[PDB]
Design a protein around this ligand. Structure first.
Ligand SMILES: CCNc1cc2oc3c/c(=[NH+]/CC)c(C)cc-3c(-c3ccccc3C(=O)OCC)c2cc1C
Ligand SMILES: CCNc1cc2oc3c/c(=[NH+]/CC)c(C)cc-3c(-c3ccccc3C(=O)OCC)c2cc1C
Lengths: 277, 277
DNA sequence: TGACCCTCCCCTTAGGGGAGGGTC
DNA sequence: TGACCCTCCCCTTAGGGGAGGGTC
């Protein structure tokens, strides 16, 4: 071959855009063998096309362009090693996605349950599967003064293990025949965990524990101040009327119904307490 | 809570950079509840922090920011569906990586073999595993006039199934006791395939076939014009001397030793021909 | 006074999409 | 004359890193 291909010809032959070729030229990754000193037209030799092989392959596996420059200088012995590295980075991506895929599925599972709920505003008993959680003591906090900020450390922690930060906020309190909200004080506030990912060195002010599998007397509803205490009361009454035995704190879970800064915020609230008989 | 968090406070609480908050502000994704009309300082309410939950989660799974705007307007019923979509896109990514991971491994396998080679310039017989390939007739082409461009359609095709374009170039020719290069003409030129990926509607001028598993008389060496024909001759002689029976065309494979536009190009050449006795 | 916050401004990666003007 | 090619120039995404100057 003693001619020359024009940019368009290379483009059509190698299945690479003309823009790409001009760019690889500027980058000094793949430069035409000859540039007409007047028209500036780019001209390529046939033998030179071989170099687009490595470039197109590396582009396919995501290698950044500047990285390619040092990959072409390596050499069949080291290129083998180079690939070994790309592999390790690929399995890294894979592991990440698999984990991610598992998490999304769990979020969806829990998300679906809050949609299958028997009825709102009514107490009912059901067999629950366990729920892993991370908690910390409430230090004075109660329904009237809890803040999103109160969950900062817990969230920082779960975020580090799940990536997918928590959706629901939890709190617990002693099952008592309260007569007023102000009488209530939280024992712990918690956020459920979604991963069995070996917790990133948990500090001792946090406790990894669980809302155990068992029978629970529950009530769920869409939050409204003049409903919070009444639903609690329905739970208290329900348990007293059928003489049930409470064997846990009252578990309280709050989950936003939407995250739109545009519409009036609304929350789903759920109170459950484990029972025996 | 009847105060206000400053940008720095939100940053520390939600584990999101200050720059990020300013940006989410500009984008109109997450805007502070209040902006001091004089200092321009941004101020946020505690209740508002809840919105960073969805945002941080979507950012974790790769959802583009502008996409988030429409995700917050959706609503626990549709958000479920939204996640289902993200899942489908995640498995898409996974499948891609797995395939990619398999390919890289095969490239490495073949790449290693050409490094384990017994010796260069010497004929030797070995048991080969099959090699899938895609070929087309050579139409007159021979060792003296083959061009990289000659492989354009074949490459376009393999690229579509492997992503990782071919590394080696092949050709075949009738086993004859040639006395000169010019007497040689290729029957087919081919590129090996690396994927069992249902070939993207192959046209009939191409043939999916194989260099079959079997015993081959081979010779590999680093290309040099005044060596090409001599090595062929060593093969011819080797086969005649031990009276072997040839049962295939001569398979010729060329692979660049490096893809550096900076150093003198060099190639590994390999000729193999299947035999019986 | 230190921290804290704000508004530019430049910069990163891999080209795609023109617009205006030559060029086999 | 159509195709073909070239050189700007603007633009995309998600902020990070300052620089210069106010601000609890
Ligand atoms: C077990 C999960 N724990 C939580 C429990 C909560 O119980 C609350 C009871 C109330 N009771 C009246 C008797 C009122 C007024 C607000 C409450 C908030 C609240 C705080 C700040 C801004 C908005 C809200 C808010 O509107 O939250 C919806 C529950 C709240 C928040 C969390 C995290
Ligand atoms: C089975 C694979 N098929 C191929 C076989 C080939 O055999 C060749 C034999 C030769 N023999 C002299 C008797 C010479 C001179 C060049 C050859 C080239 C070649 C063509 C253009 C630019 C550089 C080279 C080049 O330098 O290629 C290295 C082989 C070549 C290319 C391919 C794809």
């Amino acid at each position: 071959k003693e001619s020359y291909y024009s940019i368009g010809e290379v483009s059509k032959l190698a299945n690479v855009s003309i823009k790409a070729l001009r760019y690889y030229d500027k980058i000094d990754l793949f430069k035409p063998a000859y540039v007409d000193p007047d028209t500036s037209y780019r001209y390529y030799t046939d033998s030179q096309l071989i170099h687009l092989d490595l470039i197109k392959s590396l582009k396919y596996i995501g290698t950044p362009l500047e990285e390619m420059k040092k990959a072409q200088d390596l050499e069949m012995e080291e290129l083998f090693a180079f690939y070994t590295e790309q592999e390790r980075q690929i399995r890294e991506k894979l592991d990440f996605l698999s984990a991610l895929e598992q998490t999304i599925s769990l979020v969806k599972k829990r998300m679906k349950r809050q949609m299958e709920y028997p009825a709102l505003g009514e107490v009912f008993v059901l067999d629950e599967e366990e729920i892993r959680i991370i908690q910390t003591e409430a230090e004075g906090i109660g329904p009237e003064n809890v803040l999103n900020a109160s969950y900062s450390k817990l969230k920082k922690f779960i975020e580090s293990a799940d990536g997918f930060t928590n959706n629901s906020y939890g709190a617990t309190f002693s099952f008592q025949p309260y007569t007023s909200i102000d009488e209530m004080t939280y024992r712990h506030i918690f956020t459920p965990v979604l991963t069995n990912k070996q917790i990133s060195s948990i500090t001792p002010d946090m406790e990894i524990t669980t809302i155990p599998k068992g029978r629970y007397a529950c009530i769920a509803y869409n939050f409204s101040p003049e409903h919070y205490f009444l639903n609690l009361q329905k739970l208290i009454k329900y348990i007293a009327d059928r003489q049930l035995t409470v064997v846990s704190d009252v578990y309280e879970l709050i989950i936003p119904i939407h995250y739109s800064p545009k519409k009036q915020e609304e929350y789903r609230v759920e109170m459950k307490i484990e029972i025996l008989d």
